[PDB]
Design a protein around this nucleic acid. Structure first.
Ligand SMILES: [Mg+2]
Ligand SMILES: [Mg+2]
Ligand SMILES: [Mg+2]
Ligand SMILES: [Mg+2]
Ligand SMILES: [Mg+2]
Ligand SMILES: [Mg+2]
Ligand SMILES: [Mg+2]
Ligand SMILES: [Mg+2]
Ligand SMILES: [Mg+2]
Ligand SMILES: [Mg+2]
Ligand SMILES: [Mg+2]
Ligand SMILES: [Mg+2]
Ligand SMILES: [Mg+2]
Lengths: 206, 62, 143, 262, 60
RNA sequence: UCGCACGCCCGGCGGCGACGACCCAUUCGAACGUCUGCCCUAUCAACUUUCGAUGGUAGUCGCCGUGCCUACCAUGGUGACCACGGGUGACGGGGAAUCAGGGUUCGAUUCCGGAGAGGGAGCCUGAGAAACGGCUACCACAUCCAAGGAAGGCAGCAGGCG
RNA sequence: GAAACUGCGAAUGGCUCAUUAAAUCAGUUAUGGUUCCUUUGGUCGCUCGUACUUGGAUAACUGUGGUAAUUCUAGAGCUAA
């Protein structure tokens, strides 16, 4: 099959290794997973030592950690926007390790408004008449209200993050290897790496 | 893979100059004096004494 | 200076984006009495394969060599030079093994001929298995 | 080979078993167990060559499978079980207790033991591990994982294990002055006091050890097994007591003793 | 063309040789595991539907 | 889940085992790596490279490290200290013969390591195989036949032809 | 207690030396860069949410076969882990 062997290739001196044995089973390669975005499909490969690897093939969700606030929630993957290796792996939507995906910011919006009780996103002028976001933001006790009033001094966010919340979907990096683990986990990009990947995206946009 | 020894050793050595008359007469004197069957029984004793003397010479040069 | 290439270049154990109101960088001592250089602590570079600021562990053997080429990207070639003994002719023959060694960018000024010390580690690429651990300058050349 | 080997050859067996050369092509491949292959002495070799309680492989099989041999306090039935260093054989019916201690040369010695000594054995620890809830673990030389030990027990010490419980009773720490049986190398079987410990980072740390008769000699630390504080052991010592008299002194002792015997 | 008709409510079975293509074209060009009405098999076969379950060739 | 004994509180408690299991050690290992060592040949002096050659960064695959493979950059890497190409009546070693001291020649051969089952290739099962006294193709060969089909692999032990 | 399902082994052994010239191999160390049936020791009520034992198939067995022929196998009945 697909081989992973140094003996099929040249020396450091540019020589030619003639092989002394045929292809082995520990010298094994299997084809790529190429995990797209769709309703979840994971095949299971049994591997050397009888263990299991989980090829994702099309995959929709994954838990992302927004770690400056340390909130890690299961989130729906919207899109693949940037990949440091190959631009056609952006052009088709392929989930790989250390590619930039987009994820809907509704669970982090829920957490922020339930922890600090301040709105984020929220183009000002609208209030949700289902009334549950303002029953989350209002009407607490006088013992717990000082707790919220002391936590609301550490409740200012990066403006890059905040306009991503207002647009409704965040930039995030895949950390796991979804052809290996079967999951599409990772972390929300904030900071100088967020500004790095944003200027990369808009310079590619031209 | 069979379970046996395959260990064997010659107990003599044939001399290099074959027809030296002094050596022939001396070996046949020893055969006649001590009733030996052939020249190999002279050569095997010369070989045992040669190995004893070779171990001797290496211990003395030690 | 930093962020030359496609992906973001950061050290993987540091979390750099904790909420405020200079980054700390990860570095370690590699054992065997090797002093970590001041430019590794005071620097701003990143490296997967630096022994002082990266994900390698110096094990096994600790060899030496002379710098003979520095044309590559963040790796040099050292020329181990030794003798070899023939049992017939009680003499020697001068042999050599050129070998590629990953030179970390914390050693910022080195010119060819300097006697570096290298350490065995994880195989970093196809023909590279060592790291420059310390650099001793060639004789003279103090200016 | 396409997998693990199952046969072991007669010539390729370890020399300290002292197998001969012309019985068969093979030697018993010892089963996997607590002791290494080249550092064990299997139960077939122990019952057949040493003790002469069995003549053939069928006889040692029927001895070991009418449930008489009790290794380390436990019934061990396969004849290729690796009986290793400091193990305790309990012959119940014939009423003996053996401790596989090394000899003044590289052998395992048949070493008869009283039951009150044979209800413990001594084990060098190999690892300190910490399991899932802060639970310390010793790993001895014979695969014993002993959870909750004494925190003063560190990685190159020895412990006196009670056999029917598996618990620690006491321990000797690797310091200069304590005894040592030497489990490996050219100095195998020697007994001395630890003179010196030389640290080599990365390399194998080397320990100098001095016996009773003023002979000092070095050994890598993996081959060293302390067996008591000071000169006083916590087990018995075999005949000769690990001295290694020279070949001239061995010649002189055998001719002296047998001309006194006549 | 030999037939092996089995009635599994009593557990009985029987080989019937028949060589009438008028009796057999009602079986022909129909797949396995289907219930074909066996009324064209003889005088005695009326109301019998049989699931054809596949047999063996000319060559085994 | 299975087998022996069979007791005790007033239906419930019970002892000794057998099997199986996620993980951690352990054992047998396997597997890639580090330094150094190979015979003849210059009528072989330059070879390797966008078809991976030498590095970098990010992935894919893998049991793992790794140009192993992919994408984008760098233009490197080896060589008179003999590469590269060829040859070998070349499996490597422990070792054998001959020997004053050096050497010279041999080692397919019972121990260890490697390779292979006619030649190549691909895989299933399994902890472990690219297994051939397992399978699928193709090439060469070749057996039975109702001519539609079926089956094979002695460099295993004997034995046969050449 | 034949048979058959299940479990295990069949990757060991044995034969040969065609390939193979830093390749194999030898000494050497490394896995802090990995897998490992087995065997020995740990672990194995740590989890807060019909149990006096849950389900339906299948081989062996009976009974109709097919092919010229294979360690070929089909349709029907049953019956266990
Ligand atoms: Mg010489
Ligand atoms: Mg040839
Ligand atoms: Mg050949
Ligand atoms: Mg050979
Ligand atoms: Mg030949
Ligand atoms: Mg062999
Ligand atoms: Mg093979
Ligand atoms: Mg042939
Ligand atoms: Mg094959
Ligand atoms: Mg055969
Ligand atoms: Mg075979
Ligand atoms: Mg034979
Ligand atoms: Mg074999």
């Amino acid at each position: 099959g697909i081989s992973r062997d140094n003996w099929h290739k040249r020396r450091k001196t540019g020589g030619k290794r003639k092989p002394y044995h045929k292809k082995r089973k520990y010298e094994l390669g299997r084809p790529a997973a190429n995990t797209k975005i769709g309703p979840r499909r994971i095949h299971t490969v049994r591997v050397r030592g009888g263990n299991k690897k989980y090829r994702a093939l099309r995959l929709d969700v994954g838990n992302f950690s927004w770690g400056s606030e340390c909130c890690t929630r299961k989130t729906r993957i919207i899109d693949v926007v940037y990949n440091a290796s190959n631009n056609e792996l952006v052009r088709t939507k392929t989930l790989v390790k250390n590619c930039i995906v987009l994820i809907d910011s509704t669970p982090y919006r829920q957490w922020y408004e339930s922890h600090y009780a301040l709105p984020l996103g929220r183009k000002k002028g609208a209030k949700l008449t289902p009334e549950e976001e303002e029953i989350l933001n209002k009407k607490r006790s006088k013992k717990i209200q000082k707790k919220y009033d002391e936590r609301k001094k550490n409740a200012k966010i990066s403006s890059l993050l905040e306009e991503q919340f207002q647009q409704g979907k965040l930039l995030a990096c895949i950390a796991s290897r979804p052809g290996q683990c079967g999951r599409a986990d990772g972390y929300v990009l904030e900071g100088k790496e967020l500004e790095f990947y944003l200027r990369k995206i808009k310079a590619r946009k031209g | 893979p069979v379970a046996r020894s395959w260990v064997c050793r010659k107990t003599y050595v044939t001399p290099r100059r074959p027809f030296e008359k002094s050596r022939l007469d001396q070996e046949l004197k020893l055969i006649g004096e001590y009733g030996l069957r052939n020249k190999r029984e002279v050569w095997r004793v010369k070989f045992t004494l040669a190995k004893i003397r070779k171990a001797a010479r290496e211990l003395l040069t030690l | 200076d930093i962020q030359t290439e496609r992906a973001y270049q950061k050290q993987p154990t540091i979390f750099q984006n904790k909420k405020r109101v200079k980054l700390p960088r990860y570095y370690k001592n590699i054992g065997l009495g090797f002093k970590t250089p001041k430019e590794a602590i005071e620097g701003t570079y990143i490296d997967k394969k630096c022994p002082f600021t990266g994900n390698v562990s110096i094990r096994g053997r600790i060899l030496s060599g002379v710098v003979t080429k520095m044309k590559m990207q963040r790796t040099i070639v050292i020329r181990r030079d030794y003798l070899h003994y023939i049992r017939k002719y009680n003499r020697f023959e001068k042999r050599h093994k050129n070998m590629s060694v990953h030179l970390s960018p914390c050693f910022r000024d080195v010119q060819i001929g300097d006697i570096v010390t290298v350490g065995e580690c994880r195989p970093l690429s196809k023909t590279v298995r060592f790291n420059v651990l310390k650099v001793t300058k060639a004789a003279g050349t103090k200016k | 080979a396409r997998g693990p080997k199952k046969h072991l050859k007669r010539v390729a067996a370890p020399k300290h078993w002292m197998l001969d050369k012309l019985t068969g092509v093979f030697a018993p491949r010892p089963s996997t167990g607590p002791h290494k292959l080249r550092e064990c002495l299997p139960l077939i070799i122990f019952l057949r060559n040493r003790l002469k309680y069995a003549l053939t492989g069928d006889e040692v099989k029927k001895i070991c499978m009418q449930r008489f041999i009790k290794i380390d306090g436990k019934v061990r039935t396969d004849i290729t079980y690796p009986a290793g260093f400091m193990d305790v054989i309990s012959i119940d019916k014939t009423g003996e207790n053996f401790r596989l201690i090394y000899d003044t040369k590289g052998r395992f010695a048949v070493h008869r033991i009283t039951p009150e000594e044979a209800k413990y054995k001594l084990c060098k620890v190999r690892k300190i591990f910490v399991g899932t809830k802060g639970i310390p673990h010793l790993v001895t030389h014979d695969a014993r994982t002993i959870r909750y030990p004494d925190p003063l027990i560190k990685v190159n010490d020895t412990i006196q294990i009670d056999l029917e419980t598996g618990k620690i009773t006491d321990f000797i720490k690797f310091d200069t002055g304590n005894l040592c049986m030497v489990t490996g190398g050219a100095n195998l079987g020697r007994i001395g006091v630890i003179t010196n410990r030389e640290r080599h980072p990365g390399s194998f740390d080397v320990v100098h050890v001095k016996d009773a008769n003023g002979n000092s000699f070095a050994t890598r630390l993996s081959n060293i097994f302390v067996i008591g504080k000071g000169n006083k052991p916590w087990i018995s010592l075999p005949r000769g007591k690990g001295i290694r008299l020279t070949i001239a002194e061995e010649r002189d002792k055998r001719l002296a003793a047998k001309q006194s015997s006549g | 063309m030999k037939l092996n008709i089995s009635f599994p409510a009593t557990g009985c079975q029987k080989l019937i040789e028949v060589d009438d293509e008028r009796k057999l074209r009602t079986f022909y060009e129909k797949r396995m595991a289907t219930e074909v009405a066996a009324d064209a098999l003889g005088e005695e076969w009326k109301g019998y539907v049989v699931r054809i379950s596949g047999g063996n060739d000319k060559q085994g």
